Design a protein around this ligand. Structure first.
Ligand code: NA
Ligand code: NA
Ligand code: NA
Ligand code: NA
Ligand code: NA
Ligand code: NA
Ligand code: NA
Ligand code: NA
Ligand code: NA
Ligand code: NA
Ligand code: NA
Length: 424
């Protein structure tokens, strides 16, 4: 597919979608809890929709009306035997998680998905789940979907250390541990997200964390909550950059979460000369409206130390630095892992193919700035961030075309970008 090019203005309101994993966690916890759960600002993901539908299939009443999800919890042992095979679409996140949720379900269950999903190994979750006494098994020893599962009323606690870092596996094992009789210890390899830990506690459950050591006593009961899903971090960062680098631009970005990643991106922006106003702060919700305008940017130091999720935002932040006059050094304080070093390379390659001046380094990248961008062909390679980066990069292209073939990347993104192209 080609990409919209050479726009002369950008105006409108974008409302940051909710975080996906908190969205998903809220449906899960909402079903397993007692009492009614309400979720506000949920992400309209296909992953959220599939997860809600999985739970409806296990007998949970879930209402989607006027922007609000209302879940009537069925208790920690209240999942019922489905009358159909469970559809998880292309979310591998979902299969892993629900597998742990269904550790204690005393009935047979099938979980399938699409052609992409059916190529992703599940043995990373089936191995520890089996130790607990769950029957779960996929295609080949790798356990490719479809998965066949039977949990048990005699779930044994888990003592396991992950060989690979994985928030998905950590979550499934926690959900299972919540249903097991006794003390589970789960030890992660690397520090991954705390979403499940946080939400489990918000839903009234107890754990103990000691570094990478997670201890969970089962069985537990949870209580229905009102959940306000915070704005996605990556999406908020994405639009901020767009509204700063696009010509004749003003974006009102609602529902931005006030947490450290945006906080540190905000400071970097200001340091660079960005025009950004913070408004409508909601101190209880920890959200704000951000207003950005077209800015004359100047290079700066970007210490990944000062921005947690930085690696996620590398594509959109490199585009940013590409547009600032002078040198931007992005140096990460901690060593890069293979996939991080790879992400830098792919970003540098694509933007340099469009006229940027990016030098990958052992610790990040050097960017030499205000690059008049030009046409190019670049494939996403699955990474939507890299794609949407290229989309905004495309708007800045004076002449030439921008081919971006594997732009399976899906959601309402283009309608929005069109919306902003004709506002004033
Ligand atoms: Na909602
Ligand atoms: Na209820
Ligand atoms: Na249970
Ligand atoms: Na399939
Ligand atoms: Na509930
Ligand atoms: Na947030
Ligand atoms: Na945020
Ligand atoms: Na700030
Ligand atoms: Na600031
Ligand atoms: Na490299
Ligand atoms: Na325009």
């Amino acid at each position: 597919m080609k990409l919209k090019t050479n726009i002369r203005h950008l105006h409108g309101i974008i409302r940051v979608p909710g975080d996906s994993s908190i969205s998903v966690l809220s449906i899960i916890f909402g079903s397993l809890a007692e009492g009614e759960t309400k979720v506000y600002d949920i992400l309209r993901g296909e992953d959220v929709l599939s997860t809600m539908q999985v739970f409806r299939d296990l007998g949970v009443e879930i209402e989607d009306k006027d922007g609000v999800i209302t879940v009537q919890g069925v208790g920690m042992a209240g999942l019922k035997a489905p009358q159909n095979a469970l559809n998880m679409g292309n979310s591998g996140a979902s299969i892993v998680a629900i597998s742990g949720v269904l550790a204690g379900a005393d009935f047979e269950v099938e979980m399938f998905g699409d052609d992409s999903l059916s190529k992703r190994p599940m043995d990373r979750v089936t191995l520890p789940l089996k130790k607990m006494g769950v029957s779960i098994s996929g295609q080949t020893e790798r356990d490719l979907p479809p998965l066949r599962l039977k949990g048990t009323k005699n779930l044994r606690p888990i003592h396991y250390e992950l060989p690979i870092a994985s928030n998905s596996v950590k979550s499934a094992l926690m959900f299972a541990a919540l249903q097991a009789k006794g003390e589970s210890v789960i030890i992660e390899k690397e520090y991954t997200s705390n979403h499940t830990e946080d939400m489990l506690q918000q839903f009234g459950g107890h754990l103990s964390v000691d570094g990478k050591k997670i201890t969970v006593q089962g069985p537990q009961k949870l209580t229905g909550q009102k959940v306000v899903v915070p704005g996605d971090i990556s999406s908020a960062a994405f639009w901020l950059v767009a509204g700063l680098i696009a010509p004749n631009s003003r974006l009102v970005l609602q529902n931005v979460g006030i947490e450290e990643t945006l906080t540190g991106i905000i400071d970097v922006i200001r340091a660079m000369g960005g025009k950004l106003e913070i408004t409508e702060i909601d101190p209880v919700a920890k959200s704000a409206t951000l207003i950005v305008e077209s800015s004359d940017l100047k290079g700066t130091e970007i210490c990944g130390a000062l921005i947690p999720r930085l690696i996620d935002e590398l594509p959109i932040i490199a585009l940013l630095a590409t547009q600032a006059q002078g040198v931007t050094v992005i140096k990460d304080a901690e060593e890069l892992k293979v996939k991080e070093t790879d992400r830098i390379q792919v970003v540098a390659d694509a933007l340099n193919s469009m006229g940027a001046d990016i030098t990958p380094t052992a610790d990040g990248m050097i960017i030499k700035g205000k690059s008049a961008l030009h046409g190019a062909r670049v494939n996403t390679f699955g990474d939507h961030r890299i794609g949407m980066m290229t989309a905004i990069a495309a708007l800045l292209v004076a002449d030439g075309e921008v081919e971006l073939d594997r732009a399976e990347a899906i959601p309402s993104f283009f309608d929005d970008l069109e919306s902003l192209i004709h506002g004033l």
